[PDB]
Amino acid sequence: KIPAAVSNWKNPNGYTVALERRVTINDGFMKLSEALENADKKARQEIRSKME
Amino acid sequence: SRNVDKANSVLVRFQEQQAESAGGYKDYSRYQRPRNVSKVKSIKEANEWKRQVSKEIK
Amino acid sequence: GVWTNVEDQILKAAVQKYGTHQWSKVASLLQKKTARQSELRWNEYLNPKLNFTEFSKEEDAQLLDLARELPNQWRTIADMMARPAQVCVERYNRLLEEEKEMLAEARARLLNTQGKKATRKIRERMLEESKRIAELQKRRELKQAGINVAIKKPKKKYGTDIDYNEDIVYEQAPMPGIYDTSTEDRQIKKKFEQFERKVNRKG
Amino acid sequence: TTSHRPQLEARSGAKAAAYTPTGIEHARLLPGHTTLKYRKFSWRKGTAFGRHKGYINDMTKSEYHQEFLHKHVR
Amino acid sequence: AWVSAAHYNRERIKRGAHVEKTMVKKNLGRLTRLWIKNEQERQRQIQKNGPEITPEEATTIFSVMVEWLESRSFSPIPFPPLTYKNDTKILVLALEDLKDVYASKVRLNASEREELALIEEAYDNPHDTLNRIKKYLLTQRVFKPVDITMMENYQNISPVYSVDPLEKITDAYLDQYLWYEADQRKLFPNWIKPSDSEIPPLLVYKWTQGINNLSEIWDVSRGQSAVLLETTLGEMAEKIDFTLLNRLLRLIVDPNIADYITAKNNVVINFKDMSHVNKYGLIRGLKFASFIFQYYGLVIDLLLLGQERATDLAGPANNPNEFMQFKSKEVEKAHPIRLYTRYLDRIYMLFHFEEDEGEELTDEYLAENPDPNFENSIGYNNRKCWPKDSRMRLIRQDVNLGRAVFWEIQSRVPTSLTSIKWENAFVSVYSKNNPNLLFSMCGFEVRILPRQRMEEVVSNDEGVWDLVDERTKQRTAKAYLKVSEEEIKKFDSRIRGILMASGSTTFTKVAAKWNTSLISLFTYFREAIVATEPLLDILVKGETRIQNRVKLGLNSKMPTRFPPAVFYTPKELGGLGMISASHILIPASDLSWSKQTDTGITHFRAGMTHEDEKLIPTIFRYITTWENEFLDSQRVWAEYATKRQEAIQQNRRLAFEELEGSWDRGIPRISTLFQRDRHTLAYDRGHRIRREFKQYSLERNSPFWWTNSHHDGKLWNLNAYRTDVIQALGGIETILEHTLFKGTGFNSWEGLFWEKASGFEDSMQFKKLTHAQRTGLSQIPNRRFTLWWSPTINRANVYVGFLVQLDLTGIFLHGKIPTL
Amino acid sequence: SERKAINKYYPPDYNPLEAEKLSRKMAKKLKTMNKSHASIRLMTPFSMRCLECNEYIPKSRKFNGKKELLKEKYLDSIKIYRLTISCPRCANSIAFRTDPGNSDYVMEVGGVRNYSIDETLQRLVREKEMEQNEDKMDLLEKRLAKIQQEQEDDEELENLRKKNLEMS
RNA sequence: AGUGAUCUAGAAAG
RNA sequence: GUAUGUCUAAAGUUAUGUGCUCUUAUUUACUAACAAAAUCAACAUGCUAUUGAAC
Ligand SMILES: [Mg+2]
Ligand SMILES: [Mg+2]
Ligand SMILES: [Zn+2]
């Protein structure tokens, strides 16, 4: 059985059709953000430590 | 421009005039019908005006 | 620029006809809105696929983690949450504390199915049948007046045009089989001529 | 829309066969090639990252298409 | 099949082969589909298999940037309060830059009407707009989609991004504010270009003079070498990762501004029915994109140079170096990289090596990449534009040294950040075997030859700079100039675009577009055009085709109808007012000898010629060449400095009368000192890069992107050309002999005018109806133009033409001329 | 013959002056030279609605319409024209006329648009006076409110900036 | 102290 | 690229039940398929502030 073809671009006969027919994260991102967060912490603590 | 102002150009009007002079040709559908009938004297041309009224009522 | 309830209903009814790739047609109804704004309104509020339901506790955990793993990248976070972006931004913030006339035009346009030249064509058909019935009734009046005018056949558009009443136009007789058809042939001829006399006198 | 239609069947050449040619001389049907042929029969330490420390049958992902896009879109 | 047809038609378009007018925009369409499709595939693969940048690379990049900004004692840019002193000046500069687009346009669609509505709202209500901008900076983190379009430049299409107007006002404010505060805080070192202080021809001039003024640079007696590396940072903008960008930006700007910038890049991109989120890479069309581009560029600069040599080039933070200078010769000669600059994504390095340093680098490269075949000469990028005699000579030692220099530098930047490839790199070596040092910068092909390496020191024309040793003020080298081939193709594509878009239009519009294009070429490249014969050929063809557009408008290409007086007579005398570059003689030479060595001008080709032989002047004779501009500017500004000091000592005004005669000299012009806008222009930092980046935001960007008249002044003056074309065409009495002038019965030309001098265009009602655009210019209608020049257009001595007589007159037409 | 023909054929006896005089005598009797309107193609200048059948007519729809020069002129000098179309559904005549003084159009018959010479001269003079010429305590109280609103905005923004730091 | 090298060219329909 | 469509003049009836005279476009002027991608030429040589009745 072949379904009826409903286009999202075309409507030759002007049919109003039911609306519903007209309508995970990779781990590297976590590792990258975590590493940059730790590098930022290193920067903060180094400038704080040598501020004395 | 359209057919109407081409047909009402000076050359076409002059050719109509020359044709009604040189050979008696006159397409009466171009011309306004006489309001008063009695000013028309020829039986031929009066009958042609009658034909114009006939096609108008059709 | 605020969106009215009537404008939202017009947009949904318009997308039912036009789909999600013809926003200039949608905006031709919404008189104070552009196509750009209409596509925004659909895609971010009125599309039924959007999930505006309250977040589960697991969703709040997921959203806070993603907001750390992909900082400020709210369209990416939203695509991962499978929710609208402004919803995700508001949630993240929570967790860290005369119009009748337009509707009349809308209904008139959207319930029109015919299009322009088809409407002109049915108008033309109406006029043609009007002229036909004019000839028919005039012929009937003149027949009552006792001056029997014949009906005028249509003018040939080209020199070889066909009148389908004069001939069986491309007669393809049945090929003769083994069985004799003669008796029922003369019966059919009787039937046809009887019908012709009947329509002549009874109409 | 109803003027704008797909081809359900093609026109049969049997129709053209049913009547005779009408004598128009086409230029491409003038004589030409009138005979048939026949066959015989220290400064490098100061940087963080220095070393001191194919065809596929998809036109769009092929390296030629990638190079073409990098050349002609800029 | 569709993608194959796209490939084939693109090749035909970029060749200049026959292509239909509709086919060009069809190809534009198909190719923009294919580019978006490929970019979507790239973004999805980044999401699937992860970021290109490793965590180790990210943490050490962050460490390098932190080390730099700490060593500079950089104070990060704060968020601007409403009490900020420069708020109204920053906003008025932003709104002026935004309004400059629509002051020069008439096709105002709804978005661009809304633009002007918001701009006039903002001019009316500065405080309201400041408050709105700042609350959006603090709070808004989700943005409307960006439409992308592509612009058909006939060598390649280029992207253009349409941002929402209300967002665009915020982005313009932020761009202005960031560039101002970054100049105040000295974020960007001297080597980062374009700069507010230099037009691009002056950057090329200062680079060449800087090379010549390095100590011991030209000596080769000890086996020294100089190496000049030019390459692009390939794919730099599209490889910017947003979390690395956000944590990098937080080192220099307030977290609210960094978060705004980061979120503003993460937007939906739309084209027709195609739509995707930009999840990776900078959108070049954002108004602040130049800032992001230059700061990410500074990260890459620090990776290339290292901390130590970067501090050498930039100098101590409390009194930094000016561009290409050092605090002493000891600091200069400490390290092989003598000079660095980056113009956007093009880096330039000069290395000076001792003989043993060069040997060491070369044997390292050959240790890892040995060449027993001597195949290294194959695929070595070399300058086609110069003869074989004077381009780089591919000796074994120099080729290997250049490959080693590249091979060293390519390691220094991760591939995840930038795509540095040999195929996009040029490495010229100056040595005992190579006397010429070559590079290409800003569209100028440059070849430096020292006087000590010239076999005979001849005198030269314009288009050869003499480079001066500033220690003695003596000339010590020559720099030969040409236009880059890609810039010649760009000019040809521009004239081609004019020709295509000008079907059945007014002739004076075509002439005006040609004039604008020719002026933009000649005022930019100036003297580099002289030695560039392919450009002269292209110029002649282009002017001929521009005239052919007029001729085919009149359905007749016949030369005798259209003498030079028809085209080159000024507009107020009824001509098209074209400016000429094509009536020159073109230098001609033996092709083989010219491929091999500098033949010299032995012969001349005829350029454009007409049987009415007239000495039409050239545009080139009225523009001061850049060498003379820069030398005169140095003299002029030093003189002004001395005058300024004595005026300060007197405590009286350094007068207008005291600087007259020097008023219209200098780069920037002396006149810039005294313009009334000087006090508001002082805050418009970053204007030049902003003007160059407009190519990504706006369709049909200006051809004069390289100079800002407000900051640089008026850098050319073509008033004399009009007088000289009038005299060249035989004077006014000769010009009107071609015209229907005496058919009017007027006695004399003087006192006659075309415009009817009505007061309607001064009406307030007209101002209400036409407020978007200035309207001083006036076209000549085609029928009036044809009637005016009718005694020569309908002349009697046609080559062919069927003689017919107009009805009921004794007028004869020789052929068919439309509108006559 | 082509569109752009240069010459037309005149008979050898053709005198142009006599021909024009004869054609002028003829023109007073031809039907289509003396009918009261000129047929034209035009776009609908504004959105309008038919009153017979309530059909909406959008702007920029092309029609075949009738043009009439009217007897009356704007300020006795400038030509006014009536422009008449017919409704696409029901064929009823819709008419509107030009309004030269406003540089606009005004509706006449059959439809409705969506959304005196002495008096006119006086109004024009007064308009020119406005063109050339182009509560005190209430305005001061508005200046008080404006200055308060301006100075309080910085504190509001600083509260948002601090709130963002707290949220972070 | 002067040798020469010389493209074109218009009509219809859309 | 100056759309295009229909209509009619038919035939009478097909057998039964010349003056005068304005005109410096004083024209109801008509057509839009055609093209639209406009910015070189700007901008003067030097910035402003003013008047209440009466007890
Ligand atoms: Mg056609
Ligand atoms: Mg067409
Ligand atoms: Zn109606």
CA nearest neighbour of F112 among F158, F53, F159, F167: F53
Cβ–Cβ gap F23/B13 under 8 Å: yes
Note whether E262 contacts C85, CB cutoff 8 Å. no
Neighbours of ion ligand 3 (CB under 5 A): F 50, 52-53, 55, 87, 90, 92
Nearest to E816 among F4, F158, F165 (CB): F4
C72, C88, C91, best to mutate vs chain E, most E CBs in 10 Å: C72
Cβ contacts of F21-30, under 8 Å, gap ≥ 24: F22/B13, F22/B14, F22/B17, F23/B10, F23/B13, F23/B14, F23/B17, F26/B13, F26/B16, F26/B17, F27/B8, F27/B13, F29/B31, F29/B32, F30/B8, F30/B13, F30/B30, F30/B31, F30/B32
Asked whether the beta carbons of F37 and F44 are under 8 A apart, the reply is: no
CA atoms of E224 and E431, how far apart (whole Å) = 6
SS3 E545: helix
Cα A37 to ligand 3 centroid, rounded to whole Å: 71
Q: Residue C70 has what DSSP assignment?
A: S
Q: Which residue is nearest to nucleotide H44 (CA to C1')?
A: E675
Write phi, then psi, for C39 (nearest 5 degrees).
-60, -40
| Interface list for F 48-67 with E (CB within 8 A) | none
Nucleotide G13: closest residue by CA–C1': F2
- Give the closest-approach CA distance of E148 to chain C in angstroms: 14
Is D63's Cβ below 8 Å from some Cβ in E? no
Residue of C nearest to E241 (CA): C70
Sequence-ordered list of residues with C-beta below 8 angstroms from that of E315, at least 6 positions apart, any chain: E321, E326, E327
- The residue with tokens 């009823």 is F92
E558: nearest nucleotide, CA–C1' criterion: G9
Question: b vs e for C57-78, b when ≥16 Cβ sit within 10 Å of the residue's Cβ?
Answer: eebeebbeebbebbbbbbbbbb
| Residue type at E813 in one-letter notation | L
CA dihedral D24, D28, D32, D38 (to 10 degrees): -110
Touching B (3+ Cβ pairs <8 A), the chains are F
Separation CA E181–CA E71 (nearest Å) = 19
F56 touches chain C (CB under 8 A): yes
Pairing of strands F78-86, F93-99: antiparallel
Interface test with F, best of B6, B10, B20, B28 (most F CBs within 10 A): B10
Size of interface D-E (CB pairs under 8 A): 64
Q: How was this structure determined?
A: cryo-EM
Q: Which residues of E touch D57 (CB under 8 A)?
A: none
Q: Kindly determine whether the C-beta of residue E513 is less than 7 Å away from any atom of nucleic acid strand H.
A: yes
For residue E575, the SS3 value is: coil
The answer to whether C73 touches E143, Cβ cutoff 8 Å, is: no
Distance CA B6, CA C56 (A): 80
Contact E35 D73 (CB under 8 A): yes
Calculate the angstrom distance between C1' of H51 and CA of E767. 38
Exposure string of F91-113, with b = 16+ CB inside 10 Å and e = fewer, is ebbbbbbbeeeeeeeeeeebbeb
A36 closest CB neighbour out of E48, E49, E247: E247
- Say if the Cβ atoms of B13 and F34 lie within 8 Å: no
Ramachandran class of E157: left when φ > 0, alpha when ψ lies in -120 to 50, beta otherwise: beta
Q: Which of E81, E127, E256 sits opposite F164 (nearest CB)?
A: E256
Query: Distance (Å, rounded) from C-alpha F19 to C-alpha B15?
Result: 9
Named by the residue before each, gaps in chain A exceeding 2.5 A from C to N are 23
How far CA F27 is from CA of B14, B19, B20, B21, D74, in Å, comes to: 11, 16, 15, 16, 68
**Resolution of the coordinates, Å:** 2.8
Nucleotides of G under 7 A from a protein CB: 5-14
Whether nucleic acid strand H comes within 7 Å of the CB of E509, the answer is: yes
Helix (H) or strand (E) holding F143: helix F136-167
In order, the DSSP letters of E364-419 are HHHHHS--SS-GGGTT----TTS-TTTS----HHHHHHHHHHHHHHHHTS-TTT-B
User: Could you tell me the distance, in angstroms and rounded to a whole number, from the CA of residue C120 to the centre of ligand 3?
Assistant: 14
Is E157 close to D60, i.e. CB distance below 8 A?
no
Between helices C74-81 and C57-69, what is the axis angle to 10°?
150
Give the tokens for residue F117.
């010479």
Phi and psi at E710, nearest 5°, equal -65, -40
Q: Which residue is nearest to nucleotide H5 (CA to C1')?
A: C124
The partner residue sitting opposite F32, judged by closest CB among B4, B16, B17, is B4
Beta bridge partners of E350: E228, E339
Token readout for C200 is 């002549």
> What CA–CA distances, in Å, run from C84 to C45, C87, E159?
8, 5, 28
Q: Tell me C45's DSSP state.
A: I
Smallest CA–C1' separation from E25, nucleotide:
H37
Query: Which residue, E734, E784, E789, E749, is CA-closest to E566?
Result: E789
Q: Which residue, chain included where needed, has tokens 């004595």? A: E646
**What number of CA atoms fall less than 13 Å from residue E724's CA on the CB side?**
14
SS3 call for C128: helix
Cβ-based burial of E804 (10 A; exposed 0-12, middle 13-18, buried ≥19): middle
Residue of D nearest to E42 (CA): D61
Of B26, B33, B27, the residue nearest B56 (C-alpha): B33
Distance C34 CA to H37 C1' (A): 25
Helix (H, G, I), strand (E, B) or coil at F43: strand
Instruction: Identify whether the C-beta of residue F100 lies closer than 8 Å to the C-beta of residue F80.
Output: yes
Name the token pair of F99.
């309004």
Question: Could you tell me the two tokens for E275?
Answer: 């739509």
| Nucleotides in chain H near protein beta carbons (<7 Å) | 1-3, 6-10, 17-18, 21, 28-32, 34-42, 45-47
| Strand ranges of the sheet holding E437-441, from the earlier edge strand across to the other edge | E437-441, E444-450, E474-483, E464-469
**E798's tokens:** 């046609």
B2 contacts in chain F (CB < 8 Å): 39
**In the Cβ-directed half-sphere of E496, how many Cα atoms lie within 13 Å?**
20
Alpha carbons D48 and E220: distance in angstroms, whole number:
33
- CB pair distance less than 8 Å for C17 and A11: yes
Chains that touch E (3 or more CB pairs under 8 A): A, C, D, F
* Alpha-helical segments (H) within F58-135: 117-133
Report d(CA C159, CA E443) in Å as an integer. 73
What is the phi/psi pair of residue E428, to 5°?
-90, 140
* Residues 6+ positions from D44 with CB-CB distance below 8 Å: D50, D52, E408
Closest CA to E407 of E249, E243, E545, E229: E229
The distance of C106 to chain A (nearest Cα, Å) reads 13
Between the CA of F86 and the centroid of ligand 3 the distance, in Å, is 8
Structure tokens at E607: 């350029």
- The long-range contacts involving E320-329, CB below 8 angstroms and separated by at least 24 positions, are E320/E186, E320/E189, E320/E190, E321/E190, E322/E190, E323/E190, E323/E191, E323/E195, E323/E206, E323/E210, E324/E190, E324/E206, E324/E207, E324/E210, E324/E213, E329/E215
Which residues lie across from E276 on neighbouring strands?
E269
CA–CA gap between residue D21 and residue D16 (Å, rounded): 9
Report the gap between the CA of E698 and the closest CA in chain C (Å): 19
| Nearest nt by C1' to E777 Cα | H41
Q: Which of E404, E725, E400 is nearest to E568 (CA)?
A: E725
Query: Which residues on adjacent β-strands are paired with residue F95?
Result: F84, F109
Sheet order of strands, F56-57 included: F56-57, F48-50, F111-113
Contact at 8 Å (CB) between B11 and F8? yes
Task: Name the strands in the sheet holding F104-109, side by side, starting at the edge strand that comes first in the sequence.
Answer: F38-43, F62-74, F78-86, F93-99, F104-109
Q: Which residues have a Cβ under 8 Å from the Cβ of E495 and sit 6 or more positions away?
A: E514, E517, E538, E542, E545, E546
Q: What is the DSSP string of D11-59?
A: PPHHHHTTS-------GGGS--S-S-------TTSSSSSSTT----S-T
* E512 in contact with nucleic chain H (CB within 7 A): yes
Residues 6 or more apart whose CB falls under 8 angstroms from that of C11 comprise: C26, C30, C38, C41, C42, C46
CB of E605 within 7 Å of some strand G atom: no
Secondary structure class of E150 (helix, strand, coil): strand
